């Protein structure tokens, strides 16, 4: 009966991030997912696929967790929804807020504000940064600095923070007031620079840009500890220490975008502790619930919270609120997700098997003639494909090497993403992954990379 | 142990729309909701309150629907989540998309795009309006016109559309490019104008503003059929016909913001059919799931969809996507919600009992010395309090008459909202409301209004 559903799909469902015409015509074939379990999903044809991307870096505890379904259900029966306006709460949202601060967030974090998506979380961050400066009497200190290849969402303001051109095309972005310093990708550094030199370059370029704009006009700097969607750029050694020194010098807030990195993905609690970042504000989503329900959390530091608190005395309640902020079933899902992360120590398993997977990818693909670089950290890994490795020359985009390798992986029964704006194969498997399953993943990638190299080299 | 939960609440939970200091100090006392059923919620002290506001205009099928919990649970077990990127779907999201278009949306609607909140839905609308114009080669046609007292969300861009100052304070809003024409509130019209004259005034003011800005720079006009949060402003007879004529003359898209009005609230399928609106784009959330799970839907008309579809051929896939777009458990919740709305004909009940409630409040409050106007439509109603009715003179805001009446209602065990920026008591009860329950609501309001009158007058 799937033919009828696909007719309806093409007629009426506008998908995110999907070629509108090819989808409506049938040229881009649809795929219905009917179930899932462990690290595998099942499609409408009965195929069982290894999901080496955990949905979108988000199904961290793995698929098919009926424990989380039970928790969601229980809360849905008891109280599916009430608002959290004007001091209203559930037990679940209170408990979740204290657990995030006490067990997961870095030191000196104080409060949590809830939305539904990473994008609305970063939208909240922009509102908060402005508010902070206005109530401290600095109405000019408003600009946000992001980075090239950063992903921070798909809205107008959040799309502007995003430093990938597809999220800007025909939307008139980035808006004035948001700027982009350099992507800290060492492999693509100015030729001849060593790691320490490149760090200095990145710091100097940021300093330069702050000064060019005027430090009294620059409010915040936003960054992922490890860049995910852009894809899987690990920062060079000393990058975050060097950047923070510049930010302290000019009194610029650090927003850590931990939507991908939080809740165990890198083998640490969050990327911020792992890289010695000391952010003033933190964005989370994805691994917060392992996607069992939609939820985002903005974690607010002492510095910013204290200013917001004092200001309310003279300025009244801050005018910010989503109807579904603190949604009970979503909170309940998060609590169950956290219970599982803690009980099975999936943070530890991510460090263990992530190191193993990364090292196995390194052995098997360093020196391979299609591959320009192997990178990764914890349970994130990527192969970037280049026409000329030492020259840092990419393939012609129209050759579609990344997408071809991904497609070959999918024919062998594995999902691994062709990352955007480059020829990059990304891995972000569930944190329950075993060594055996990692070996299988690497085997399938080997075959797919060999096959595509045979066709294009 | 609720004392410990409130200690944790104050320490760690940043609520939406809540005085930060008063909340943290304890001056604004917290409230935990533990259960709910029909039209009543239960707090942490065992108090049972009549919720005459259905959460926030959103719990339309009523509280305690274990049918929806069952549907959520079933989907959580089967497949809680996969993405809907690149043509991927579930059965539920496909079914929901065809049911919205076929059974609920007005004629000539084609596609549905999903988010999680009303705000992110309207953010999608802005992105879509820009895209449309850019790919038609009109890069100047970008400005959006909203209205004074419109509520369209709590983001930066969506906060700008919002025409209530609290959503702008210390956020530097509205952003350049968004403008606000007049609030179509007849009772507050220029003195001496009759209904038909006021309609003409509103049309002329809009024409004026389009011309002042330059019609080739104006892309869209956004409006709620009936203004909710602003609060409960029913448009004058002929307003929407007159406004649409102006919009057609200058080729300006109509965005109907149906977050409140959709799915039965006004006694029609949506407000747009009810008021003869023919929008190009529609925003929905709230009543789409009755808040049992977070979901928003942008409904895209044929005109706009066809342009988007053609454009993808030369321009490639549109760069828009939320990770949780089309979230399966949320879709499943919507389907169950729709099943209930249709089965118990809650649209009809909303028309019946809503007319009864509105009339029953007109009888009891028209002529009452505290009340300047009684207004409403379907299951929306409001009492606006004035110092001088015939003069249209409001009370001193510092007298807090609206909030006082609301507080008195809450002591008698009923929740009814003190609407912002005015002295207004709003009603938006679940659509399952009976005549008997409406009488009870009116009784409690009478007592509370009498008490506050014999106290301020
Ligand atoms: C993946 C990611 C998001 C995703 O946001 P959604 O609105 O949930 O799509 C947001 N911010 C950052 C930094 C990310 O890495
Ligand atoms: C109530 C309303 C919203 C609410 O948005 P959330 O983000 O769900 O709180 C948004 N837009 C409009 C037009 C509304 O009337």
- Strand-strand pairing, B424-427 and A371-377: unpaired
For residue B321, how far is its CA from the centre of ligand 1 (angstroms)? 10
* CB contact (8 A) between residue B155 and residue A15: no
Which residue in A408, A445, A306 sits closest to B20, CA to CA? A306
Buried b (16+ CB within 10 A) or exposed e, A391-420: eeebbeeebbbbebbbebbbeeebbbbbbb
Q: How far is A42 from A33, CA to CA, in rounded Å?
A: 6
B434 by Cβ neighbours in 10 Å (0-12 / 13-18 / 19+) ranks as middle
Which residue in A95, A230, A209, A262 sits closest to A165, CA to CA? A230
Q: Which residue has the least CA distance to atom 14 on ligand 2?
A: B152
Which residue in B39, B102, B40 sits closest to B342, CA to CA? B102
CATH number assigned to the domain covering A65-343: 3.40.640.10
Measured in degrees and rounded to the nearest 5, phi and psi for residue B112 equal -125, 130
Sign (positive or negative) of CA dihedral A44, A49, A54, A55: negative
Q: How far is B414 from B407, CA to CA, in rounded Å?
A: 9
User: For A42, which DSSP code?
Assistant: E
Q: Under 8 Å CB-to-CB from B163, ≥6 apart: which residues?
A: B146, B147, B148, B149, B150, B151, B180, B183, B230
Sequence-separated contacts (24+) of B202-206 with Cβ below 8 Å:
B202/B236, B202/B239, B202/B242, B202/B243, B203/B242, B203/B243, B203/B245, B203/B246, B205/B181, B206/B145, B206/B181, B206/B182, B206/B243, B206/B246
Q: How far is A413 from A299, CA to CA, in rounded Å?
A: 38
Q: For chain B, give every residue range classified as CATH 3.90.1150.10.
A: 1-64+344-457
Q: How far is B209 from A139, CA to CA, in rounded Å?
A: 29
| Integer angstrom CA distances of residue A106 from A258, A287, A302 | 12, 16, 11
Output the DSSP codes for B371-433. EEEEEEETTEEEEEE-SBTTTTBPPPGGG-HHHHHHHHHHHTTEE-EEETTTTEEEE---TT-
Structure resolution, Å: 2.6
Q: How far is B209 from A264, CA to CA, in rounded Å?
A: 53
A392 Ramachandran zone, left/alpha/beta (phi>0; psi -120 to 50): left
* CB contact (8 A) between residue A18 and residue B59: no
Strand partners, A301: A109
Whether cis (ω within 30° of 0) applies to the bond prior to A383 is: no
Buried b (16+ CB within 10 A) or exposed e, B174-191: bbebbbbbbbbbbebbee
**Which token pair is B222?**
């956004």
* CB contact (8 A) between residue B72 and residue A73: yes
Q: How far is A142 from A218, CA to CA, in rounded Å?
A: 6
- Strand-strand pairing, A40-43 and A48-51: antiparallel
Count the Cβ atoms, other than its own, within 10 Å of residue B334.
29
A63 lines ligand 1 (CB under 6 A): no
Sign (positive or negative) of CA dihedral A340, A341, A345, A346: positive
Count CA atoms closer than 13 A to B279's CA, side-chain side.
28
Sign (positive or negative) of CA dihedral A359, A364, A367, A368: negative
Q: Are B14 and B8 in contact (CB under 8 A)?
A: no
- Rounded to 10°, the helix A328-343/A346-365 angle is 70
Q: How far is B140 from B221, CA to CA, in rounded Å?
A: 16
Q: How far is B429 from B441, CA to CA, in rounded Å?
A: 10
DSSP helix/strand/coil, A417: strand
Buried b (16+ CB within 10 A) or exposed e, B445-457: beebbebbbeebe
| Integer angstrom CA distances of residue A435 from A351, A432, A438 | 12, 10, 5
Q: Are A143 and B349 in contact (CB under 8 A)?
A: no
Q: Are B147 and B180 in contact (CB under 8 A)?
A: yes
Buried b (16+ CB within 10 A) or exposed e, B68-93: bbebbbebbbbbbbbbbbbbbbbbbb
Measured in degrees and rounded to the nearest 5, phi and psi for residue B395 equal -60, 160
For ligand 2, which residues put their CB under 6 angstroms from it?
A 322-324; B 117-119, 122, 151-154, 224, 228-229, 257, 259-260, 283, 285
- Strand-strand pairing, B88-89 and B109-115: unpaired
Nearest CA to CA, how far is A244 from chain B (Å)?
26
Buried b (16+ CB within 10 A) or exposed e, A290-306: bbbbbbbbbbbbeebbe
Q: Output the CA torsion B71→A116→B61→B36 (10° steps).
A: 90
Sign (positive or negative) of CA dihedral B303, B305, B308, B311: negative
Q: How far is B128 from B122, CA to CA, in rounded Å?
A: 10
Q: How far is A179 from B426, CA to CA, in rounded Å?
A: 43
| Integer angstrom CA distances of residue B450 from A311, A446, B276, B422 | 36, 79, 39, 19
**Which token pair is B212?**
């002042």
User: For B177, which DSSP code?
Assistant: T
Q: How far is B146 from B252, CA to CA, in rounded Å?
A: 12
Q: Are B246 and B253 in contact (CB under 8 A)?
A: no
Q: Are A283 and A255 in contact (CB under 8 A)?
A: yes
Count the Cβ atoms, other than its own, within 10 Å of residue B435.
12
CATH number assigned to the domain covering A1-64+344-457: 3.90.1150.10
First-last CA distance in chain A:
42
First-last CA distance in chain B:
43
* CB contact (8 A) between residue A112 and residue B14: yes
A170 by Cβ neighbours in 10 Å (0-12 / 13-18 / 19+) ranks as middle
Q: Are B218 and B141 in contact (CB under 8 A)?
A: yes
Output the DSSP codes for A371-388. EEEEEEETTEEEEEE-SB
Q: Are A2 and A29 in contact (CB under 8 A)?
A: no
Strand partners, A283: A257, A298
Instruction: Give B84's contacts in chain A (Cβ within 8 Å).
Output: 13, 15-16, 18
Task: Beginning with the edge strand found earlier in the chain, give each strand of the sheet holding B414-415 in spatial order.
Answer: A88-89, B31-37, B40-43, B48-51, B414-415
- Rounded to 10°, the helix B346-365/B328-343 angle is 70
* Length of chain A measured in residues: 457
Compare all CA atoms of chain A with the CA of B2 and give the residue at the minimum distance.
Answer: A91
Count the Cβ atoms, other than its own, within 10 Å of residue B425.
31
Measured in degrees and rounded to the nearest 5, phi and psi for residue A401 equal -65, -50
Q: For chain A, give every residue range classified as CATH 3.40.640.10.
A: 65-343
Measured in degrees and rounded to the nearest 5, phi and psi for residue A220 equal -150, 160
DSSP helix/strand/coil, A122: helix
Q: How far is B32 from A138, CA to CA, in rounded Å?
A: 37
Which residue in B385, B375, B382, B288 sits closest to B338, CA to CA? B288
Q: Are A36 and A62 in contact (CB under 8 A)?
A: no
Buried b (16+ CB within 10 A) or exposed e, A180-189: bbbbbbbebb
* CB contact (8 A) between residue B56 and residue A166: no
Which ligand 2 atom minimizes the distance to the CA of B286? 8
Q: How far is B414 from B406, CA to CA, in rounded Å?
A: 9
Measured in degrees and rounded to the nearest 5, phi and psi for residue A161 equal -60, -45
Q: How far is A363 from A247, CA to CA, in rounded Å?
A: 38
Q: How far is A403 from B190, CA to CA, in rounded Å?
A: 63
Q: How far is B137 from B133, CA to CA, in rounded Å?
A: 6
DSSP helix/strand/coil, A30: coil
Q: How far is A201 from A278, CA to CA, in rounded Å?
A: 21
Distance of CA B71 to the CA centre of its chain: 25
Q: How far is A73 from B162, CA to CA, in rounded Å?
A: 35
* CB contact (8 A) between residue B156 and residue A126: yes
For residue B230, how far is its CA from the centre of ligand 2 (angstroms)? 12
Q: How far is B37 from B88, CA to CA, in rounded Å?
A: 37
A167 lines ligand 1 (CB under 6 A): no
Q: Are A38 and A432 in contact (CB under 8 A)?
A: yes
Of A55, A98, A309, the CB nearest to B12: A98
The three-point CA angle B452-B456-B457 to 5° equals 110
Task: Beginning with the edge strand found earlier in the chain, give each strand of the sheet holding A424-427 in spatial order.
Answer: A371-377, A380-385, A424-427, A417-419
**Which token pair is A399?**
């050759």
Q: Under 8 Å CB-to-CB from A230, ≥6 apart: which residues?
A: A149, A150, A151, A163, A164, A183, A419, A420, A421
Q: How far is B74 from A66, CA to CA, in rounded Å?
A: 10
Which residue in B308, B324, B242 sits closest to B275, CA to CA? B242
Which residue in A326, A287, A304 sits closest to A125, CA to CA? A304
Q: How far is B295 from B288, CA to CA, in rounded Å?
A: 7
Identify the residue whose tokens are 């430093």.
A163
Task: Beginning with the edge strand found earlier in the chain, give each strand of the sheet holding B417-419 in spatial order.
Answer: B371-377, B380-385, B424-427, B417-419
Task: List the helix and strand counts (H, then E) for chain A.
Answer: 15, 16
Q: Are A353 and A433 in contact (CB under 8 A)?
A: yes
Compare all CA atoms of chain B with the CA of A75 and give the residue at the minimum distance.
Answer: B69
DSSP helix/strand/coil, B309: helix
From the CA of B325, the nearest ligand is 1
Whether cis (ω within 30° of 0) applies to the bond prior to B174 is: yes
Q: Under 8 Å CB-to-CB from A88, ≥6 apart: which residues?
A: A82, B15, B30, B31, B32, B33
């Amino acid at each position: 009966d799937f033919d009828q559903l696909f007719e309806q799909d093409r007629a009426h469902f506008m998908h995110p991030s999907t070629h509108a015409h090819d989808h409506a015509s049938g040229a881009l074939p649809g795929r219905i997912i009917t179930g899932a379990s462990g690290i595998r999903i099942r499609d409408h044809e009965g195929r069982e696929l290894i999901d080496a991307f955990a949905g979108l870096y988000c199904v961290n505890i793995g698929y098919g967790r009926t424990e989380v379904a039970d928790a969601i259900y229980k809360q849905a029966k008891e109280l599916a929804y009430y608002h959290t306006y004007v001091g209203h709460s559930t037990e679940a949202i209170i408990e979740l807020s204290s657990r995030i601060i006490r067990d997961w967030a870095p030191a000196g974090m104080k409060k949590v504000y809830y939305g539904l998506s990473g994008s609305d979380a970063n939208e909240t961050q922009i509102k908060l940064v402005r508010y902070y400066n206005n109530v401290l009497g600095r109405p000019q200190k408003k600009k946000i600095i992001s980075r090239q290849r950063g992903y921070h969402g798909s809205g107008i303001m959040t799309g502007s923070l995003t430093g990938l051109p597809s999220f800007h095309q025909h939307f008139d972005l980035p808006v004035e007031g948001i700027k982009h310093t350099v992507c800290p990708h060492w492999y693509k550094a100015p030729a001849g620079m060593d790691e320490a030199a490149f760090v200095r370059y990145c710091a100097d370029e940021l300093e330069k840009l702050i000064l060019a704009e005027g430090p009294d006009t620059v409010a915040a700097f936003i960054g992922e500890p490890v860049m995910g969607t852009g894809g899987i750029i690990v920062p060079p050694k000393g990058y975050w220490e060097a950047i923070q020194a510049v930010l302290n010098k000019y009194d610029v807030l650090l927003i850590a975008d931990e939507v991908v990195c939080a809740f165990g993905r890198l083998g640490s609690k969050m990327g911020s502790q792992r890289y010695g970042m000391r952010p003033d504000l933190i964005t989370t989503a994805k691994g917060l619930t392992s996607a069992y329900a939609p939820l985002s959390a903005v974690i607010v530091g002492e510095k910013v919270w204290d200013v917001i608190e004092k200001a309310s005395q003279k300025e009244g309640a801050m005018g910010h609120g989503w109807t579904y902020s603190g949604h009970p079933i979503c909170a309940a899902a998060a609590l169950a997700n956290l219970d599982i992360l803690e009980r099975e120590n999936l943070t530890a398993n991510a460090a263990d098997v992530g190191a193993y997977l990364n090292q196995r990818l390194r052995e098997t693909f360093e020196g391979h003639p299609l591959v320009g670089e192997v990178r990764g950290d914890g349970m994130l890994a990527a192969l970037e494909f280049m026409a000329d490795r030492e020259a840092r020359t990419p393939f012609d985009p129209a050759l579609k090497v990344g997408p071809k390798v991904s497609a070959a992986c999918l024919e062998d029964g594995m999902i691994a993403r062709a990352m955007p704006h480059g020829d990059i194969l990304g891995f972000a498997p569930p944190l329950v992954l075993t060594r055996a399953e990692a070996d299988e993943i690497v085997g399938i990638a080997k075959a797919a990379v060999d096959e595509v190299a045979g066709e294009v080299l």
